[PDB]
């Protein structure tokens, strides 16, 4: 298979607007949401149909209890950060954990925290230490690193358990996650040439323009890979035409091991 990843996010908000949850937690496999929990529902629920069909009620009930606990821990930690920053108002706390299983069989694992959307603490599971970005994080780093067993626990989870979960979910959702839908690609001019692709899955795609068989990335406008809403994606890239000299332009698209070239007459 190609590269896949599993990650869980947590969001905490210290003084949210009424109705807006103080805590949200969402899991993803690749770009697909799989799980959700918040402080309003107080329930962990599936966000993909192949998760609901393959995980028994005891799974959702157990993690519902753990997430109620994790919700409280997040509030306490955010309260401590905002006090040590001496910040008034509403501020945010975020966590991301997960792992990648790469095409060549190697793995990665990551765990990090953010305050107000900026990196705060970043775990290094090889040196078993926390990288702090400022003195508030430095205070937390000291406390967390004093609990050596917890660092070892996180290394084991990232390297063994997380990859096991990922393989389990990849099999559950194999009909969605392991399929290939090739792009439909077309060129037009609006002067500049636009190369547009749509209808493809997975979302990873590379589009570029070549001039007389040469690539110059600083002359190309790259569009974002965007969801179309039906499970497929679309993207584009553009380049401006030199009206003073003749040149052969070509759009090149690489997707899921297939290369396409569209030569402009």
């Amino acid at each position: 298979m190609r590269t896949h990843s599993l990650r869980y996010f947590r969001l905490g908000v210290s003084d949210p607007i009424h109705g807006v949850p103080e805590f949200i937690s969402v899991g993803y496999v690749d770009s697909h949401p799989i799980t959700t929990y918040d402080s309003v529902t107080r329930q962990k629920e599936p966000r993909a149909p192949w998760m609901a069909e393959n995980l028994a009620p005891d799974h959702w009930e157990r993690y519902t209890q753990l997430l109620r606990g994790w919700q409280q821990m997040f509030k306490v930690e955010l309260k401590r950060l905002q006090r040590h920053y001496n910040h008034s108002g509403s501020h945010t706390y975020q966590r991301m954990i997960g792992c990648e299983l790469l095409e060549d069989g190697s793995t990665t694992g990551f765990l990090q925290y953010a305050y107000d959307g900026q990196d705060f603490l970043i775990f290094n599971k090889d040196t078993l230490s926390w990288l702090a970005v400022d003195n508030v994080a430095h205070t937390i780093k000291q406390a967390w690193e004093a609990n050596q067993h917890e660092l070892l626990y996180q290394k084991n989870w990232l390297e063994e358990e997380c990859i096991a979960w990922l393989k389990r979910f990849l099999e559950y959702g194999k009909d969605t996650l392991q399929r290939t839908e090739p792009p439909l690609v077309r060129v037009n001019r609006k002067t500049a040439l636009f190369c547009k692709a749509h209808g493809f899955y997975p979302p990873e795609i590379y589009m570029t323009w070549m001039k007389n068989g040469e690539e110059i990335v600083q002359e190309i406008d790259y569009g974002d890979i965007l969801p179309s809403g039906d499970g497929t994606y679309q993207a584009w890239a553009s380049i401006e035409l030199d009206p003073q000299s003749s040149n052969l332009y070509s759009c090149h698209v690489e997707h899921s091991g297939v290369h396409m070239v569209l030569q402009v007459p």
Partner: antibody
Amino acid sequence: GQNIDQPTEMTATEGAIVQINCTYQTSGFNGLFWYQQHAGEAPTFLSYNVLDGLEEKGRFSSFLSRSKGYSYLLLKELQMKDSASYLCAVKDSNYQLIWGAGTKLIIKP
Amino acid sequence: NAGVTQTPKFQVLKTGQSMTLQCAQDMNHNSMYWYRQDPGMGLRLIYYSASEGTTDKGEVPNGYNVSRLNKREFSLRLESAAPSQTSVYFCASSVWTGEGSGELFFGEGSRLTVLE
């Protein structure tokens, strides 16, 4: 099914060394604990292992092999006060503890 | 600075009698647990409370109920005692949820004998 096995009873001599074994088959692994429980008293925490290897804490050491699903608790220079039950417990993939039935350690003076 | 305080240490009951076991912890712990211990088997979880304001069943919840009254207290109720509930009951707590390397802290135990 998830299972954890340890011998029911062991007898050793004062001053000697004893190794208490614990084997486990679980759905996932998030660490192995040893607890001491004197007769008629509460269990108390002794040790935690989650990566492979040996960890020492006084006269007690704890070893873990994740690939073999095996741990031992090593007691050196046995004293009469080491007479107790020793409980092994493993956290599974959903962080639920599975408890062994305990090993009663009897020490001959 | 008392740790985990549970009561009573001993209790005899007649079949059908009600009983509440009390447990409090003063360590500012978030998760609390009720276990039973019986000869020849490992500890079995009855009910647990991952955090203040939530509880859920363990492995052997039938015949029991719990109340997480506040952050400190987690009581165990036997509404109609049965001879099979003769056992030694342990309350325990940990700093946070069962997720992580954190150990359990146990109360002294409550020995119950239920007689016809």
